[PDB]
Amino acid sequence: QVQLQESGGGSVQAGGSLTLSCAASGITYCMGWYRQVRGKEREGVAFIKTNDGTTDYADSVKGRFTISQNHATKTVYLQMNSLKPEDTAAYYCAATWRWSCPLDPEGYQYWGQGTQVTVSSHH
Amino acid sequence: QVQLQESGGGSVQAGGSLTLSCAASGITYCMGWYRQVRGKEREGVAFIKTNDGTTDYADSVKGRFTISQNHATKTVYLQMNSLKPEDTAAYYCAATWRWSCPLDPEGYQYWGQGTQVTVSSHH
Amino acid sequence: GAQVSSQKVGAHENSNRAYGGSTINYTTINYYRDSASNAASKQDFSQDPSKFTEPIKDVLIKTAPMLN
Amino acid sequence: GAQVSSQKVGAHENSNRAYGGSTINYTTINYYRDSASNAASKQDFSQDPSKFTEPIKDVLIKTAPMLN
Amino acid sequence: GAQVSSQKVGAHENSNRAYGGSTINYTTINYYRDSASNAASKQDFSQDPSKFTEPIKDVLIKTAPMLN
Amino acid sequence: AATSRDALPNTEASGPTHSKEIPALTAVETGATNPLVPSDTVQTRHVVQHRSRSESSIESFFARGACVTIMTVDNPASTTNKDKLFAVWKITYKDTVQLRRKLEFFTYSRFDMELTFVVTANFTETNNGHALNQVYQIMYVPPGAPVPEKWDDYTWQTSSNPSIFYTYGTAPARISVPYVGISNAYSHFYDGFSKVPLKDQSAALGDSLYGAASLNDFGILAVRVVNDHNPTKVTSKIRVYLKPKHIRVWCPRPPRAVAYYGPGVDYKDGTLTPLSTKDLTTY
Amino acid sequence: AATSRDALPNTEASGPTHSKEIPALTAVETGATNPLVPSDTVQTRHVVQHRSRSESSIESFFARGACVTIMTVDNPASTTNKDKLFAVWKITYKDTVQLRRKLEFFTYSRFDMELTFVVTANFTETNNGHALNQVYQIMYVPPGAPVPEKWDDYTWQTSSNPSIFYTYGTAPARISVPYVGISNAYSHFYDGFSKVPLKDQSAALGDSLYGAASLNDFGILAVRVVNDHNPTKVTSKIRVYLKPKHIRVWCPRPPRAVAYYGPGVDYKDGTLTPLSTKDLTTY
């Protein structure tokens, strides 16, 4: 019964890059399949398998984000680059062991508290 | 889980000799390796093995001190002779079963309360 | 009246001077009067899937034309 | 179908009229159907450390010159 | 591979039609691989106290003069 | 023919020598380790040797049961805001250190796993509350099988999942599992990648983590408290002890020198100093 | 040929005598103890003797299990300032008296040790607090092995240390250990020093304690309470009962006369009076 925490999130300008950390309780990756689902409301971004590889990204963000696994610390990150005002969203992290279901927000069992990221239109 | 006690410590003049007692709880020597680490802060003097011999002394004090084992009473002593003003320090006693580590103050697990010894410059 | 049967050895212990090698057998003794009460042998058979695969009246030869 | 095996006697009891002396053996009966479930025999072999010590193609004679 | 041994009967039950009379024996089966693990037989020997009593080089005859 | 409990080679009496034989001379360039016994460099007496390598046999070396994981669960009040914590754990030896390091001296292996479960319990709140003897369920969910979502969902009905109902305070639970390896031997190390990055694809779609595979994937254990909510919160820990039995291994490697960091062969900085100070010319 | 349960030598009928034979005369200067049976100094009837020395056999004499040590542990509240007390004990019979004195009649021995652990428990605070049945771990740390530092450190993972998980309230824990002696026999006494003081060294570096050695070093036992912190402090005592089985001994010595003092052969003053007052000419 893992417990997520959204850390390393804040304000930045447009064009830059920011990193997001997602440490977890346990017996972390044991619930498996960590995710990154943004949106002010609900919308995926990154998905990842605790084992093997096994990346995949939302078509809308494809080629600018990356989700990584630090099994030792038990933290899952999210490197967001070339930010643009439309990236100012409510970031969260998720998990479900079910080795599938990455295309449904309500398919999950675990959720953290969140961290608001702001891509300030400076330029 | 031994418990140390620093007794038989006090003021004396320069040149003389004083004895220090270190009784312990238990199941005493069972945690093994008793020590004598002086310094106002932290610095060794005598080290000793509950079994066999097995003496060794700090180069700075070598040839004027002796640490002994009274397995019956469960007390470890410290005969300090030919005292000199630089001997006025905060005396303590230690233990760790780990048959080694006598050259690291933070390698220990057991510590007593202490006894201030004063080599008063009378002469 | 015991029932000694064989086991299909899996991970053979670096032995043939007791384990692994020489056939390993197990004993089984029934303690109750009812067949229901008996343990599950597991030494069950296996048959040809033909009563499903070839439910056909005529005989099938896998090299000749099915419909002739 | 029991498995009686020998033991390497250590401290021989002042006996040879039962213990110590006359070979001491132990019985072993398997109670489960699976090999996994079996006890660890411990009567394992031992081999020559040559597949490590002398991984050489030619034969080594410990009295002659290594490199000739 | 059991070990059946005899017992030194003490209070003989008014029987010889089972107990007391006819030699009473007990069974013993080793369940562990180690000799340490074995039970204590108790069927130990007994020796002559001479390696203490007569530690003398020459032979002692209890009827003749000790010092001759 | 040679077993574990056999006596080692008997030392033979050797005397003075002056010959064209050169035992002492080798050349480790050959990779071959010179085999020199006592009766070579020195004159030795005849010794009927008695020492045996019995306890050093593969089976014997791993003959102890190690602590692989600690799983926490509880039984909170029916009035609590949080959900009844049930544990889920990915089956692996790696999580700790000891058992792992021992399994590291070799490149491969086969071994029937035997499991032990020494469960413990305790209260948590400062209330003189009561709790009846608790019942525990240990559920083996193989890869890709229904992993529970709640402490009380259809999953635990386990029509096909091998589970273990442990009644607190009794002789610890135990089960045996043979070689479930997908291979011929379980790979403790794996040089590679589960995927191969391709060219007419994208870096995202062909990215994989180095060192891992399905080889070391066997499933997870799900543990709960079968008893319902009780007026007093009672936490519980599940210790799993694994012991390899009937074991074989292939190709040695040197033991783990520095402190572990992750399930990979990786190492953290600051822990790169395994040794200590000691003079070259001092005993 | 002669066993323990055999009947002692039968008394033979002896009558009047007047001969050149002198049974009654000896001279204890020979060291030899004169062997005189009943039919010597007095006329005895024929007696078919029945008494056997069965119960006096080496094995039988040590056939009881003695109390070697008492180890204290507890389970204090999660809020306490002090640490959860776990016990560590140096493995030895000497700590008490009885078992030791019995082992003192001989100079040497070999015996497979069998251990027993009768654990007990109780609460300590004046609180009607609750405690679930506690689990206990007995851990054998051989010489120079990781001795625990806390009640919860990597050490207890014991991938190689033979431990015992005892569940309070059940038939006491037991293990058997064969002759682990470094010698051929365990030396109950040892005239010597582990080190030899040298001349081109210093009195400090070659000083050793008389009577001790590695012979009597086997390791220590570490006991704890596997259950976590509980709202009520529950102390516990671990009694270890050792029983020598399959035993042999060499060369007798007289039993310990005066009260013990230390692990050495040493004696304290004031306890040097073993006997009492009794007249020479009074029965």
Added chain:
Amino acid sequence: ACGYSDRVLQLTLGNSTITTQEAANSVVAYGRWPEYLRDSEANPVDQPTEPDVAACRFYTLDTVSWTKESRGWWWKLPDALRDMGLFGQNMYYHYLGRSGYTVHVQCNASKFHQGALGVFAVPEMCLAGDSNTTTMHTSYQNANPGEKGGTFTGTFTPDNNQTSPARRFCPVDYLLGNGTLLGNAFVFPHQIINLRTNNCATLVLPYVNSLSIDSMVKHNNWGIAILPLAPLNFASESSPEIPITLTIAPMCCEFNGLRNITLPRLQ
């Protein structure tokens, strides 16, 4: 008698032949010599192509330089030979394949040079990552450097760029790159080119894995790690240099599962 010396040797496979006059014989790993998969231990079902000579021939990978300040070198198999003639081709053309080798590390100097090179053969030589932030994250492009090979280092350097990491191996020599003690590496089949003695090395390594036949592109069997045991010193010259060359030849190679060509992103 007729001059059969342990230093004088001739290796031949297919259309390639290696000769040496300063050898320390040859090392047949674990006592096993290459052979084809036994019908007993067989796995897949299809017909196996045994290229033999076509693939069973000595291939000289690129040559590196050995100076004083060299920390080490590392090669993977079947990686390095992924760009080698037919063996290279057939490889990409299949899903499963097993192959043995005959690493012939050459490295000569003079009677006036000194030092030692430890040529080790670690089955499943798994090296460590470069960052303390993301474990097991080294990318494939750096994991399979190919014939140019990877190099060891004398100090651990953590990667601090979390924006776009390096994703490469950072192997510190005294830890074999895997965190064990190099001094214990003398357990894996090996030979020491101690200049004075011989001038080459030879280690025939049979197919080892947990599987009977496995994927080549994906999985690497044997790891060739060459680290300097003794430093290269020459005369009274501050910068001495001699080259090191390796020529590993596959043996008893076969392939199963003919599919379309694999084109892996290498950079």
Added chain:
Amino acid sequence: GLPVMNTPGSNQYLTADNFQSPCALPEFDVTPPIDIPGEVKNMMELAEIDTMIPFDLSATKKNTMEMYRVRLSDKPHTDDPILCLSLSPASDPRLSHTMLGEILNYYTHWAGSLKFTFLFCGSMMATGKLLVSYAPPGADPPKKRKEAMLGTHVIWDIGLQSSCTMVVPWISNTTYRQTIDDSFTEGGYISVFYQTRIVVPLSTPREMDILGFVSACNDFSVRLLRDTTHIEQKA
């Protein structure tokens, strides 16, 4: 599996039991034992070795060498005792502290024959005859030679053979006596008396010593092991 039923005695730890138990160090290489000289097999061996009886336990002489020195003199003839003793091997302060005494103290019942052996320790030019005796119990403890003379005794002459031996044969109501001070199973009385006196010439010490050595005879046996009282761990 197998239908079993628990009987009273399950879960009880007997200190004197004998049951197999699992092993802590499987396959531990047991070091073969050598053949060390002098191996015992029974306590009764330690018992059949003469032991110096610390007779005189007077206020002054106790716990010092003088407790083993029964001093004789050249005084004129008298029927008065040289030494008196209780055949209470396991309980008499005089006999309870000897090897034989110490063995019995771990048992409840002792039975068989005992054997006292006296050694004359006076000059070569000194002579004499003594009457060491043993009378069964249940009557007047003899205080005059005349009475001890009425029992089982061995008249001893002092000479070249310095030591003598009187064998107290087993003559007791029960098959075994209580190792303690009990009447029903009381032992008796051992007493030494001058048969003539000690005669010495001029220039010879008029006083000397005699040592005693108690041991058992081959038919000596014991039963029912118990704890001794000769040691105690206080606090």
Added chain:
Amino acid sequence: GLPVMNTPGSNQYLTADNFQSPCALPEFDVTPPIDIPGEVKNMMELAEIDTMIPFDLSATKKNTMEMYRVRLSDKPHTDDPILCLSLSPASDPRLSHTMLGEILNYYTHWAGSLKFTFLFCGSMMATGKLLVSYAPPGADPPKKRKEAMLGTHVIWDIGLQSSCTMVVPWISNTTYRQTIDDSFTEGGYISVFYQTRIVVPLSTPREMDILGFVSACNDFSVRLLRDTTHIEQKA
């Protein structure tokens, strides 16, 4: 059914036991194992493979390549040591970190013969003779060739055969020594000394290195498995 009684030891989990237990996956098809090359059977095999001793563990050279390089030079003759060592395979920092060292650290008692093998790593035109030695313990640690020369040693000539081997035979009081730093079971002293010196001609490096390789001889055995100290999981 069957009358049974429970004995002490019921309901106790031994970590080192050996008892049959039920199965979780009945009839699981076990994948037949292949014959993978290189199979061990005993730890003593891993031990009889030479292992490079990381000798020089000085402040600067530790934890770097330089710990295995015992550097020699062409300086004039001297009886001063090249290297000193404690025959404490399982405890000496110098020996505790070798394959042989690592195996023993899981045991309590080690016994048998060890074998050091030194490799000369200097130019072909360089020559010499060295005296590697072994003296039993319980005396002065030798610091002069003259003393090491009084013990078990192997005089070594540097030549075509670059390596040599001195066999430290088992000469110890007990049947097995403590794997730790204990005196009673202390090992000894291993020391290398110049028998002549190192001679080189012009145009040759005046300094070179020598590597060491420790291993065991066929009669090497161990007993009583325990946990090591060379690793620890903190927090």
Added chain:
Amino acid sequence: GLPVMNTPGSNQYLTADNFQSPCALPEFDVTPPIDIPGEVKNMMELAEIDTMIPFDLSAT
């Protein structure tokens, strides 16, 4: 009676075990089974029967 000792695993219910157990209806007359046509023995039989693959799983 018989000296026995309990081992870890006593009082544990395995869902996948196989152990004899007492009977609830002693001597219940079991109705003899007939020979009904079509009897399976292994799941692999159900598997070797062709099965129509529902290929196109498009939204519509």
